[PDB]
Paper text:
Mutation of the RT-loop sequence E88AIHHE to VSWSPD (‘NI1-2’) or YSPFSW (‘NI1-3’) led to an increase of the Nef binding affinity to 179 nM or even 48 nM, respectively, indicating the enormous contribution of this region to the PxxPxR recognition of the SH3 domain. In addition, two long antiparallel helices α4 and α5 (residues Y85-K98 and Q108–Q122) of Nef form a characteristic hydrophobic interface for interactions. The accessible surface of helices α4 and α5 is separated into two parts by the highly conserved residues F94 and W117, whose aromatic side chains oppose each other and act as gatekeepers to form a barrier in the helical region. The mutant residues V90SWSPD of the Hck RT loop undergo tight interactions with the proximal region of these antiparallel helices, with tryptophan 92 of Hck contributing itself to the high binding affinity with 41 interactions to six different residues of Nef within a shell of 4 Å. Many of these interactions were mediated by stacking of the aromatic side chains W92Hck to F94Nef, as well as facing interactions to W117Nef. In addition, R81Nef in the PxxPxR motif of Nef showed direct ionic interactions to D96 of Hck and the side chain of Q122Nef made tight interactions to the hydroxyl group of Y89Hck (2.6 Å) and the main chain oxygen of V90Hck (2.9 Å). Likewise, the hydroxyl group of S93Hck was hydrogen bonded to D90Nef (2.6 Å) and D95Hck formed an ionic interaction to K86 of Nef. The 8-fold increase in affinity of the Hck-SH3 RT-loop mutant VSWSPD compared to the EAIHHE wild type sequence is largely due to multiple interactions mediated by the central tryptophane residue. While the site proximal to the PxxP motif harbors the central residues of the RT loop, the distal site covers a newly identified N-terminal helix of Nef (residues 60 to 69) with W61 mediating multiple interactions to hydrophobic residues L104, I113 and L114. Of note, the acidic cluster motif of four successive glutamates (E66–E69), that was reported to interact with the sorting adaptor protein PACS1, adopts a helical conformation on this structure element.
The Nef protein is an accessory gene product of HIV and SIV that is dispensable for virus spread in experimental ex vivo cell culture systems. Thus, Nef is an important factor for AIDS pathogenesis. To achieve this multitude of activities, Nef has evolved as versatile adaptor for protein interactions that lacks intrinsic enzymatic activity, which allows the viral protein to affect a wide range of host cell protein sorting and signal transduction processes. We thus chose a strategy aimed at wrapping the surface of Nef by the combination of different, physically linked, target domains and the iterative optimization of domain composition and linker segments.
Author numbering:
A (entry chain B): 79 to 138
B (entry chain A): 56 to 155, 179 to 205
The structure:
């Protein structure tokens, strides 16, 4: 099932490949290879890389 | 008036105390350098800035602090004349200007879209 994370800080992307988010946004984690994870925004449905230390995993 | 890449970088170095963690390190690539070039072009503040070694370091540290790129990718070919970026993808070059009397070269940062397609550092050297 879905890995859900909550943003602890705002993050501004400088690239179409990276995903901007605001503190408190929830995201689904699609890939966790290294420290930059691929995620999808539940708000905007846009997808891309995020800094994993800006988010907290919740649930289960 | 814009909202400047230079003024943000400069203010971060002076205060030095972020409200959020340092993003993880990741390697520089052609696509990241290209994307950062376009972002800073559109943001404003780097185009036309008068070059110094300290200014370049301030900007490199800001890019490192914000996006995680270790600050050793922003190198240029040696003078004299135009200095071309050694990292292919980075679309800024350093251009001599008329001093507006010295005599050391005053340089400005200049965006150049042809740098996305012509690795001039390599098409003009061999290292």
């Amino acid at each position: 099932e879905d890995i859900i994370v909550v943003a602890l800080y705002d993050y501004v992307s400088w690239s179409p490949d990276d995903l901007s988010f605001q503190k408190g946004d929830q995201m689904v984690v699609l890939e966790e290879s290294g420290e930059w994870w691929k995620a999808r925004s539940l708000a905007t449905r846009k997808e891309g890389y995020i800094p994993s230390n800006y988010v907290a995993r919740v649930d289960s | 008036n814009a909202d400047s890449a230079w003024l943000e970088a400069q203010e971060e170095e002076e205060v030095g105390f972020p409200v959020r963690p340092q993003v993880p390190l990741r390697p520089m690539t052609y696509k990241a350098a290209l994307d950062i070039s376009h972002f800073l072009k559109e943001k404003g503040g780097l185009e036309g800035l008068i070059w110094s070694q300290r200014r370049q370091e301030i900007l490199d540290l800001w890019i490192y602090h914000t996006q995680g790129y270790f600050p050793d990718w922003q190198n240029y070919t040696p003078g004299p004349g135009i200095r071309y970026p050694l990292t292919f993808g980075w679309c800024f070059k350093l251009v001599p200007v008329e001093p507006e009397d010295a005599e050391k070269e005053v340089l400005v940062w200049r965006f150049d879209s042809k740098l996305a397609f012509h690795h001039m550092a390599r098409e003009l050297h061999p290292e």
